[PDB]
Amino acid sequence: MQVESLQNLQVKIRNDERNHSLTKKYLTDDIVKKYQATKTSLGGTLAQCVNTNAYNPGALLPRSCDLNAYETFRDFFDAVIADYHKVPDGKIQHPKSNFGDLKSLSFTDLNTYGNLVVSTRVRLGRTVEGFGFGPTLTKETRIELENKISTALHNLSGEYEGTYYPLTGMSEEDRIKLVNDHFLFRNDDNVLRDAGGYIDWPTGRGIFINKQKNFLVWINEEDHIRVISMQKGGGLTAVYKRLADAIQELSKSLKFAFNDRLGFITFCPSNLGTTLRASVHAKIPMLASLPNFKEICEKHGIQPRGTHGEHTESVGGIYDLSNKRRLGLTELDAVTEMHSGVRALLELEVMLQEYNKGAPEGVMPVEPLTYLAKLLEGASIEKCYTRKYLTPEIIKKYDGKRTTHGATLAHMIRNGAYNNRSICPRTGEAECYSTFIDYLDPLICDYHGVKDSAFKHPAPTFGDLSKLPFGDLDPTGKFIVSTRVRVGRSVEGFLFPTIMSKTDRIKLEQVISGALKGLTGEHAGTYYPLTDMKEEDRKQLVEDHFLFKNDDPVLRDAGGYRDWPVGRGIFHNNSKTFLVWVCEEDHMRIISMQQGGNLAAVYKRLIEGINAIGKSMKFAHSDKYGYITCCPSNLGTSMRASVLLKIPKLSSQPKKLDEICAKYMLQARGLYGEHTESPDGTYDISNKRRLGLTELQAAHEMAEGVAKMIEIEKGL
Ligand SMILES: Nc1ncnc2c1ncn2[C@@H]1O[C@H](COP(=O)(O)OP(=O)(O)O)[C@@H](O)[C@H]1O
Ligand SMILES: Nc1ncnc2c1ncn2[C@@H]1O[C@H](COP(=O)(O)OP(=O)(O)O)[C@@H](O)[C@H]1O
Ligand SMILES: N=C(N)NCCS(=O)(=O)O
Ligand SMILES: N=C(N)NCCS(=O)(=O)O
Ligand SMILES: [Mg+2]
Ligand SMILES: [Mg+2]
């Protein structure tokens, strides 16, 4: 196989902005210098290994010119393997082959759990010693390999009797039937092609199929052999045993390449070790719809794969589920993990289907309350309001309940269950605060530090915008970078961004963007739908502290990134002193900011903007809780006044900082908001409480708070 010089290949890969491969990562100048003239014992080169990465930016891994590539270019492959298979401290290791004691082995049929499994499949790969892969085979040696393999296949015992169908002179209608029946590989794998997988096609290739049609072998496609066991239903025990017996019989007729570090050698580094992939095709549309679906799979040791294109137009929800691991465990370990992980996922799909029977369409489905309650147990009952008030009495009273429009208690604790460092819930609609009042009301009192709960949250009280109890603090630029004040609002009649539907978002955005487009004067500006905004535009505004971020796991697991990015947007005036996030955590976030410390100018611009917006829609509001929001922490005024405060460096004593914080009902966030760290010792310094006080008071408790936190400056 003739390819470009290794150094050309490295340039192409490196200058390709789209390439994010492990090849790119580890194909270093040192590596290229060390290996550029080196040949394997079968005549292969590192260039032949990485060729495909140069022409397919999407591929994550290299391939191998032949089985000796792993040893000959070890500095390169070990790095790639250690990373991909997540090997601890790069001590790559693989245990001796072990399928288990077949006569005593039994796994429950996977259709026990909701009867969702169309079919079950297990496959292995093997390399035969003394032969190269695509880059280093000749036409005649590939045919010799093919003959050696088919010969051993014909000598297989009774259950494995069948027919070998070479790919050469097989009709295009037989081939296309076999592929759709899930029996045969496809033709169109560009990664494989540019790795040399289709040289001299179709000679030396074929498929073996037994009479029963539940065991089959691919010769010289992606590996020397791919050995496959499969049938309808969820009978994994039978599928596994059939595979294991076949490969043990074949092991006596063929010498398979095996490595003490890497296990069985394969063409792609992804398949080293067991090479074993045990899979089901299962109907799991609700589990598949969850925000953290992939991570839930990963956590159970399972990789999900789509099946899009394998069915008619209206067939959905069918996924390939398999053990993610290959390397550093036995075959028995692998299929056991597959079986435990898939069972758990399938059971979770049954629980979701039961628990969300009858819920509104497009509304996020949720795990059962007692399931999420158990995950929440990894959170601290002293820091986490979400857990502290989720008592056994609460679960008993509220499990099974829905608001009028479908919100549950399970919904609002879900972000906490999956992000145990998070400390507040995220509600689904305004009606949550009455429906689930026994849980939310004492949490609300605790967080906001209500002292006399006999009284209403004050009516909206913004004060006289002409004579304010603060003015320009007027600093230098020594402590305060930028002054900012924001409020959240909800629109009556709409579910919150957590569980609202796509169609809801489209209608909400229309209401709000309409009002925003009509703002005049200092508040006149442009609305930017996230659907039309470029990725470097968006990231600039985010790093400029103007736009909300799109990768917060806590908001993601609460439902807030569903149907992304439909109905999300940023509005701002030309100066960017006034801004509105449409449908992030809340329906609205109305923001005023500028460089400097002039809180009064910032505050005034904010209040004027709120009133103008409020002409076109009714904000959700209660006597007890004031302006209602997604998170209970943002009730009342829903107001957060803040500056980014360079305190070099009271950070030095983060307890002199935490004391000076608890002492004002103020909160410390990172440079880029909550759940971020602070370089520079620069701190997001805001008033903590928003309920049980007016908008003037909230901003004054901040002013006094910062005025004082500053003053412990160069007395230091
Ligand atoms: N559990 C299963 N039941 C039926 N067919 C399957 C199953 N798992 C995989 N397949 C089929 O195998 C073929 C190739 O799948 P692929 O994802 O490349 O798996 P592998 O890498 O193990 O060959 C496709 O037709 C796919 O539908
Ligand atoms: N005083 C400030 N100056 C500049 N940016 C700020 C200030 N306060 C908050 N931000 C930014 O606003 C964004 C929102 O983050 P977050 O902490 O979630 O605040 P909220 O959601 O209450 O608006 C973040 O990028 C944060 O860095
Ligand atoms: N083809 C296999 N075996 N894995 C996919 C890796 S890659 O094509 O993304 O490099
Ligand atoms: N409501 C927001 N964004 N944060 C509350 C604090 S936490 O729940 O994210 O820990
Ligand atoms: Mg495949
Ligand atoms: Mg936020």
Q: Output the CA 318–ligand 5 centroid distance in Å.
A: 17
Tell how far CA 130 is from the center of its chain. 42
Residue 611 lies in a domain: yes
- Give the Cα separation of 449 and 436 in Å (integer): 20
Q: Residues 334, 392: one domain? A: no
Closest ligand 1 atom number to CA of residue 310: 27
**CA 334 – CA 331 distance, rounded (Å):** 5
**Domain check: are 379 and 440 in the same one?**
yes
In a domain, 698, yes or no: yes
Sign (positive or negative) of CA dihedral 690, 693, 699, 701: negative
- Are 137 and 157 in the same domain? yes
**Are 62 and 140 part of one and the same domain?**
no
Pairing outcome for strands 525-529 and 302-305: unpaired
User: Which residue, 90, 111, 135, sits at the end of a domain?
Assistant: 90
Residue corresponding to tokens 């009133």: 611
Tell me which of 583, 630, 631, 661 is the catalytic residue: 631
Phi, psi of 521 (to 5 degrees): 70, -130
Q: Give which of 711, 245, 575, 629 is closest to 425, Cα–Cα.
A: 629
Give, to the nearest 10 degrees, the angle between helix 331-355 and helix 236-250. Answer: 160
Task: Please identify, by atom number, the ligand 1 atom nearest to the C-alpha of residue 123.
Answer: 22
Answer yes or no: is 46 within a domain. yes
Question: Each residue of 448-469: b (16+ CB within 10 Å) or e?
Answer: bebeeeeeebbebebbeeeebe
Distance (Å, whole) CA 715 – CA 465: 34
Please give the number of the atom of ligand 3 that sits closest to the Cα of 62.
10
Q: How far apart are CA 80 and CA 86, in angstroms?
A: 10
Check if 261 has its Cβ closer than 6 Å to any atom of ligand 1.
no
| Residue ending a domain, choose from 56, 90, 124 | 90
**Cβ–ligand 4 contact at 275 (below 6 Å):** no
Q: Which residue has the tokens 């917006």?
A: 613
Please state, in angstroms and rounded to a whole number, the distance separating the CA atoms of residues 540 and 645: 22
Q: Tell the burial category of 316 from Cβ atoms under 10 Å away from its Cβ (0-12, 13-18, 19+).
A: exposed
Residues 193, 257 within the same domain: yes
Resolution (A): 2.3
Nearest CA to ligand 3 atom 1: 268
* Cβ neighbours of 172 (radius 10 Å): 7
SS (H, E, C) 627-690: ECCCCHHHCECCEEEEEEEECCCHHHCHHHHHHHHHCCCEEEEECCECCCCCHHHEEEEEECCC
Q: How many domains does the chain have?
A: 4
Taking the CB of residue 180, how many other CB atoms lie within 10 A of it? 10
- Residue whose Cα lies nearest atom 7 of ligand 3: it is 59
- 45 assigned to some structural domain: yes
Report the CATH number at residue 115. 3.30.590.10
Distance CA 44, CA 50 (A): 12
Count CB neighbours of 703 within 10 A.
Answer: 23
Output the residue whose Cα is nearest ligand 2's atom 14. 673
Residue 359 lies in a domain: no
What is the rounded CA–CA span in Å between residue 337 and residue 581? 44
Distance in angstroms (rounded) separating the CA atoms of residues 442 and 63:
59
CA of 571 to the centre of ligand 4 (A): 23
Scanning the structure block, which residue is given the tokens 């090479």? 275
In a shared domain, residues 240 and 129? yes
- For residue 565, whether the previous peptide bond is cis, meaning omega lies within 30 degrees of 0, is yes
Q: Are residues 116 and 261 both part of a single domain?
A: yes
Q: How far is the CA of 341 from the centre of ligand 5 (A)?
A: 21
Do 302 and 342 touch, CB atoms closer than 8 A?
Answer: yes
- Residue labelled with tokens 């979770």: 348
Distance between CA 484 and CA 457 in Å, rounded? 24
CB-based burial of residue 407 (10 Å sphere; 0-12 exposed, 13-18 middle, 19+ buried)?
A: buried
Can you tell me the distance from the alpha carbon of 701 to that of 695, in angstroms, rounded to the nearest whole number? 10
Both tokens assigned to 393:
């009495």
Same domain, yes or no: 15 and 135: no
Judgement on whether residues 412 and 542 belong to the same structural domain of the protein: no
The parent domain of residue 24 ranges over: 6-90
- C-beta 330 within 6 A of ligand 1: no
**Other CB atoms closer than 10 Å to residue 262's CB: what's the count?**
23
Rounded CA separation 185/512 (Å): 51
The encoded tokens of residue 27 equal 């194909």
**Distance from C-alpha of 690 to C-alpha of 705, rounded to nearest angstrom:** 14
**What residue has token string 């794969």?**
305
Ligand 1 atom nearest 120 alpha carbon: 1
Residue 199 three-state SS: coil
User: Cα-flanking dihedrals φ and ψ of residue 109, to 5°?
Assistant: -55, 130
- Beta strand 588-595 with 578-582 is antiparallel
Tokens 């290794």 sit on residue:
6
Q: Is the CB of 530 under 6 A from ligand 3?
A: no
* CA separation for the pair 498, 563 (Å, rounded): 11
Instruction: State whether 485 and 428 are in the same domain.
Output: no
Query: Which residue reads 């949550």 in tokens?
Result: 432
**Beta bridge pairs of residue 163:** 209
- Catalytic residue, chosen from 49, 65, 268, 661, is 268
675 backbone φψ class: left, alpha, beta (φ>0; ψ -120 to 50) = left
- Residue 547 sits in the same domain as residue 494: yes
Contacts 24+ apart (CB under 8 A), 177-182: 178/207, 180/310, 182/119, 182/121, 182/230, 182/310
Active-site residue, 631 included:
yes
- Cite the annotated binding site for ATP by residue number: 119-123, 182, 226, 277-281, 305-310, 482-486, 545, 589, 640-644, 669-674
Which residue type, as a one-letter code, is found at position 40? Answer: T
Q: Report DSSP state, residue 636.
A: B
Residue 488 bridge partners (DSSP): 589
Q: Report how far Cα 15 is from the mean position of its chain's Cα atoms.
A: 27
Q: Across the beta sheet with 569-573, what order do the strands follow?
A: 525-529, 569-573, 578-582, 588-595, 480-489, 639-646, 682-687, 666-669
What CATH number does the domain containing 388 carry? Answer: 1.10.135.10
Which residues line ligand 2 at a C-beta cut-off of 6 Å? 482, 484, 486, 545, 589, 593, 640, 642-644, 669, 672-674, 684
What 3 state SS string does 229-242 have? EEEECCCHHHHHHH
Closest residue by Cα to residue 436 from 361, 383, 369: 369
Q: Under a CB-based contact definition with an 8 Å cutoff, are residues 218 and 211 in contact?
A: no
Kindly state whether residue 475 falls inside one of the protein's structural domains.
no
How long, in residues, is the chain?
Answer: 716
Residue 673 CA to ligand 2 centre (angstroms): 5
Which single residue is written with the structure tokens 């857990």? 387
Of 404, 430, 448, the last residue of a domain is: 448
Q: How far apart are the first and last CA of the chain?
A: 71
Tokens 């601290």 locate to 380
Domain assignment present for residue 168? The answer is yes
Assess if residue 469 is contained within a domain.
no
Q: How far is the CA of 581 from the centre of ligand 6 (A)?
A: 10
CB neighbourhood size of 675 (10 A)? 15
Q: Within this chain, do residues 317 and 285 fall inside the same structural domain, yes or no?
A: yes
Alpha carbon distances (Å) from 147 to 140, 160, 166, 205? 11, 18, 11, 10
